[PDB]
Structures are given as C-alpha cells and as structure tokens.
Amino acid sequence: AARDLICAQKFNGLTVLPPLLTDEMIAQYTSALLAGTITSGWTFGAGAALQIPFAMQMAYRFNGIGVTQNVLYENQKLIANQFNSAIGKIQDSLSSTAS
Amino acid sequence: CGKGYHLMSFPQSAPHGVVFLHVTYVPAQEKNFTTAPAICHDGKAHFPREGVFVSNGTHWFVTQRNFYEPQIITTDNTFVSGNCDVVIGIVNNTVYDPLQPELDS
Numbered sequence A: 001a002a003r004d005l006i007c008a009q010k011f012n013g014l015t016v017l018p019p020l021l022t023d024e025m026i027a028q029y030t031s032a033l034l035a036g037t038i039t040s041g042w043t044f045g046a047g048a049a050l051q052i053p054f055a056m057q058m059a060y061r062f063n064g065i066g067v068t069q070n071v072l073y074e075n076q077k078l079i080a081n082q083f084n085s086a087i088g089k090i091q092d093s094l095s096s097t098a099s
Numbered sequence B: 001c002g003k004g005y006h007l008m009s010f011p012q013s014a015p016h017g018v019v020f021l022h023v024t025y026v027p028a029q030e031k032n033f034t035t036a037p038a039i040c041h042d043g044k045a046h047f048p049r050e051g052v053f054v055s056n057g058t059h060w061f062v063t064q065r066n067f068y069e070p071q072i073i074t075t076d077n078t079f080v081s082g083n084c085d086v087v088i089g090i091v092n093n094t095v096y097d098p099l100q101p102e103l104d105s
Ligand SMILES: *[C@@H]1O[C@H](CO)[C@@H](O[C@@H]2O[C@H](CO)[C@@H](O)[C@H](O)[C@H]2NC(C)=O)[C@H](O)[C@H]1NC(C)=O
Pocket: B056, B057, B058, B059
C-alpha cells in the first residue's frame, strides 16, 4: 500500500511495548466489580461477600443519606423507572455526541 | 487507613519515611437467613429502626447488620408507616407490645 506512520516510527529505533493486562482482563475485573456491587453491596470490599436483596441494599443507601427507608419501599417502581431512564439517557448521549 | 472497617492506627518511624499499623475489623463467619422488608401487623407496616429482619425458619427476629444478635420484634425497635398494600414482599407476623405484661401485673 503506502507508507504508514508506526512503520517509519519502528524503522528508526522506536518500539512500543504492549500493556501487561489485556483489554478482556480489564473487562473481567470490571465485571467482577459490578457483580460484587450489585449482589453483595459494600460488604465485599471489607471481607467476605454477603448477599442481600437489592431493594434492601438501596434502603440502606437511602438510610445513609438521611432519608428514612420507608420512602424507598413506597416509591420503588418510580425509582426503578427513573434509574432506567437515566441509563437510557447516558446510552443515547454516548451514541449521539462524540466529544 | 487499612483494608476493612477502620478501627485504630499507630505510627512507626523508618529510614526516609513512616510505617503505619492499621488495626481493622473484619467479619468472619456468616450464615444464611430469610429476610423481609417490612412486617404487616393488623393493617400496619413495621420497619426496623436500626437493624434488619431475619428468620431462623419459623420465628422472626430483628438483628444488627454487622453482627448476629437476635431480639424480639417489639414496638420499641420498630416504627409504623403506611399500610400493607404498597410494600413488595411484606410478611405476616406479630409485633410484641411492652405494656401488655406490665398492665396486668
Ligand atoms: C428458632 O428460634 C426460636 C427462638 O429461640 C427457637 O425456639 C426455642 O427452641 C428451644 C429449643 O427447642 C426451646 O427450648 C425454646 O422454648 C423455644 N422458644 C420459643 C419461643 O419457641 C427455635 O427452636 C429455633 N429454631 C426453629 C427451627 O424454629
């Protein structure tokens, strides 16, 4: 074909080393962190992973910021819908804007 | 300040630096339970004040989230909010009242 840029870079003694961890290993680490956070909560970062339902975990999260935990259980569907709409908004904003 | 729940820490001197000894608290031995968000008692939904509802198969208790310490479910450690028709997964159980044994005595 034609002259490339990395090839002329290589021919003058400049060498690029590969990273130690591949992209699929970083994706596996991220997937392990998601599977810990969704299932166990903050308990997997302080010892053994202890399971808990996600509604009761989110009730703990609301109780941590000064809101009583009965607000979650009476507004669970609205909060789930708001989270789903926010996730879809992030997906659309990443698919549209490239800056 | 260390891996786990931080408790206390100590400094130690070293050549060209410092060494910290972090004392931490970590949980050791867990066991499975069955839990519920609230408890429906004669049309009232009861939520725990500081704790979590558990069950040993037959009876329901309330305990700490970081240590297993079962207690009798009582209106002292529970508060009332709403009805039983809005909470998903509310179970049927009784709530003890402290005035009942001291009223007849
Ligand atoms: C669940 O916990 C209850 C409450 O501690 C247990 O009931 C006690 O069992 C002991 C041993 O048989 C008796 O001596 C007590 O009189 C019981 N107390 C009450 C209030 O019933 C129960 O055994 C535990 N296990 C199961 C499977 O229910």
